[PDB]
Amino acid sequence: HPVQVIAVTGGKGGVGKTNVSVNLALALADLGRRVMLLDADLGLANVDVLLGLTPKRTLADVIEGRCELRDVLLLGPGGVRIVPAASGTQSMVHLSPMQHAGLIQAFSDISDNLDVLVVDTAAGIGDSVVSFVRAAQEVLLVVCDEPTSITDAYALIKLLNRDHGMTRFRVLANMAHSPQEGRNLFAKLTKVTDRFLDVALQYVGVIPYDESVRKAVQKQRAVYEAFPRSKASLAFKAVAQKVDSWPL
Amino acid sequence: GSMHPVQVIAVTGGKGGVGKTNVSVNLALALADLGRRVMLLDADLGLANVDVLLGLTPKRTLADVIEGRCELRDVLLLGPGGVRIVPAASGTQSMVHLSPMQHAGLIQAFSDISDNLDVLVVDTAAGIGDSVVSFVRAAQEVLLVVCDEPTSITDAYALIKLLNRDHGMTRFRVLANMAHSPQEGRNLFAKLTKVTDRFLDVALQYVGVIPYDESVRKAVQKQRAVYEAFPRSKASLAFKAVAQKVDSWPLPANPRGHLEFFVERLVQHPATG
Ligand SMILES: Nc1ncnc2c1ncn2[C@@H]1O[C@H](COP(=O)(O)OP(=O)(O)NP(=O)(O)O)[C@@H](O)[C@H]1O
Ligand SMILES: Nc1ncnc2c1ncn2[C@@H]1O[C@H](COP(=O)(O)OP(=O)(O)NP(=O)(O)O)[C@@H](O)[C@H]1O
Ligand SMILES: [Mg+2]
Ligand SMILES: [Mg+2]
């Protein structure tokens, strides 16, 4: 039983990486999978904030040697297991390759009875982002239809490909006003990556712009839980069906 | 007389997508519209967006400067309103882990292009990484852009806490963005003040609020600044009001430097000449 590992990323700030990570995790749990969600925004933790959780200890405690990784695990909704990050601990955003590797390696000790790990990455193209993305089997790029997000997503793809040997990427359009808007967005990325790179982009669909997501964030409850019948939640179910179909 | 003070503002906020770059671009344009000589630095070093919001196509960037291929003056672009822009790179990693020395070298380089300058606006990256903290500490005024969601409040607080705890920074300016009601900006400021009052020793200063405006969405699509493309929009009028406030912050006349106890080197306000 190999664990499916999905890194949710995108370069651009605020495109919905954390919302997608949280609600994809919940949707996969709804399909019957045993799911873990790692907050890899190591110094600006938001997974706990979106879920209204107040972690006593975090990955900060782990790295500083005050506790073991198993000791910081939190229970989220639907049985999802959460690994919480720190908020405001600067050292956590520039960890050595050794510390990053050590952390990733340490997950093998809490891998029991697990089907899927979802990893929520920070904004940007920094070492923490690249380290976690490189360590995943599937790279889910969250993109929205604005020139800055398209530009940032392309930059991250180019970087991961040219410096880190990554050659396959999943693309999810978030805050789309229509499914066709997402397809057109994917078409844009396909043309520029076709022209300059040798990579395989695979489209996963859209999460629509949905006021229910804004309401869910205010409530600090996952939209998938708080508004299970909303268009966004139904779209997360669809993405989960696709993810679950991917070869391990 | 014989030292002209320069205002230096770092626009930051921790949270991704809160409007740091939109605020940087449109504050710069609004200040230029008031008659100030403005420079705008894209300090999102590895994911440049200032050029993207303005529809500029740089041939050289900060990466070329830092890596010793050209000088800072060579990469300056003339933007709307006469704002001079220093463009960043897009997808060059060797930029989101510069050494403290390399950051220092970049900051030092601005002294060569300071003539005829009133204000430098610095657009920082998301997060609390070394690049962000270095550029924030290199400025005189730190402008946190915050919106009324728990994640923005939490991230803004985290940045304030780190700067206060680790670097002794005490005073911060706060600008609310994407507000949907007239009192939302002040209410948001109060939320942040509540948390910082309880746990920190800081002095927050409320600057104002930019409303959520569909005109910003349209401007970003057109790759034109909302201040230029929709000058009568609610967002653009708010940027005008905010620039008038920013412009009123007093600068020392003829800043000639002073000594401080247990500080070896003269301490001097940013200035030119
Ligand atoms: N499908 C959606 N519909 C409506 N609003 C959305 C949607 N997805 C995201 N949002 C909004 O976008 C905000 C940012 O989402 P978030 O998941 O925090 O993005 P992020 O990419 O993780 N941000 P960051 O980690 O700081 O770079 C949310 O708080 C909502 O306001
Ligand atoms: N006042 C506003 N009204 C409406 N939309 C806005 C407003 N300000 C920002 N936006 C939207 O928010 C998006 C993000 O703005 P942007 O200025 O790129 O934020 P940022 O903090 O610089 N992101 P990043 O650098 O990637 O962390 C914009 O592209 C617009 O969609
Ligand atoms: Mg996030
Ligand atoms: Mg930006």
Produce a short descriptive summary:
Chain A is an alpha/beta fold and 248 residues long.
Describe the structure in your own words:
Chain A: ATPase that plays an important role in maintaining flagellar number in Pseudomonas aeruginosa. Exhibits anti-activator activity against FleQ, the global transcriptional regulator of flagellar genes. The structure is a homodimer. The first copy, chain A, has one domain (1-248). The N and C termini of chain A lie close together (9 Å). In chain A, helix 7 (179-196) links the parallel strand 7 (168-176) and strand 8 (200-208). The radius of gyration of chain A is 17 Å and the shape is globular. In chain A, helix 1 (17-30) crosses helix 10, helix 4 runs parallel beside helix 5 (127-134) and helix 6 crosses helix 7. Chain A has an eight-stranded mixed beta sheet with strand order 3-4-2-5-1-6-7-8, sandwiched between helices. Chain A contains ten helices and eight strands. With 248 residues, chain A is an alpha/beta fold. At the A-B interface, helix 6 of A face helix 6 of B. Bound molecules: phosphoaminophosphonic acid-adenylate ester (2 copies) and magnesium ion (MG) (2 copies). One phosphoaminophosphonic acid-adenylate ester sits between chains A (13-19, 41, 46, 123, 174-175, 207, 209-210, 213-214, 217, 232) and B (15-17, 126, 149, 151).
